[PDB]
């Protein structure tokens, strides 16, 4: 039925208009707190910025270490196929859980590996990839 598809289109447009509204509002009104001087300071500043944005959008964002095998195993525990999830991430691909609830985005600060974890009770998509990775770029551009 075209009804269902239509509700899906409508939901997509509303949701990403709202999330884009939030992104733009924050770039305009929220002071960016810049942490620098080491990988861990940078990582903290990125984590806080992602959080500031996810908090106002009905989804959670986190910056997860993805350096040591211990880090990798921690991340992938709660997934159906951890070895496979890990291969994808190692290969540097975005990983989308099929049901639309989790995006995992391999991310690098200087020479340290992380994964930006995005979850949502409704839906996350490539639009969220684009918005959240844009912010990591803005963070880098705002450094001295």
């Amino acid at each position: 039925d075209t009804r269902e598809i239509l509700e899906e289109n409508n939901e997509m447009l509303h949701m990403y208009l709202n999330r884009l509204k939030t992104y733009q509002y924050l770039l305009k009104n929220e002071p960016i707190h810049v942490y620098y001087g080491s990988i861990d300071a940078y990582a903290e500043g990125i984590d806080k910025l992602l959080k500031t944005y996810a908090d106002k959008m009905n989804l959670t964002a986190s910056l997860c270490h993805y350096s040591t095998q211990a880090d990798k195993d921690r991340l992938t525990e709660h997934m159906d196929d951890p070895a496979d999830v890990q291969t994808r991430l190692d290969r540097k691909d975005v990983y989308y859980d099929q049901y639309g609830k989790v995006v995992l985005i391999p991310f690098t600060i200087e020479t340290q590996n992380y994964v930006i974890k995005l979850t949502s009770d409704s839906i996350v998509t490539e639009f969220d990839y684009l918005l959240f990775t844009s912010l990591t770029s803005i963070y880098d551009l705002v450094l001295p």
Binding site: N10, L13, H14, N29, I32, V34, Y36, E44, L63
Partner: protein, 44 residues
């Protein structure tokens, strides 16, 4: 999944010297939202 650091310095950056007309939806997309919802509600 919550990296924290001792940090050498703290800074605050802001968008300040300028201001912009605030948000409003366009007629184009307002029409699309209205028609969507009126059609969704018409199958149901």
């Amino acid at each position: 999944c919550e990296p924290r650091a001792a940090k050498p310095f703290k800074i605050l950056k802001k968008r300040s010297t300028t201001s912009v007309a605030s948000y409003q939806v366009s007629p184009h997309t307002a029409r699309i939202f209205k028609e969507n919802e009126r059609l969704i509600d018409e199958y149901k």
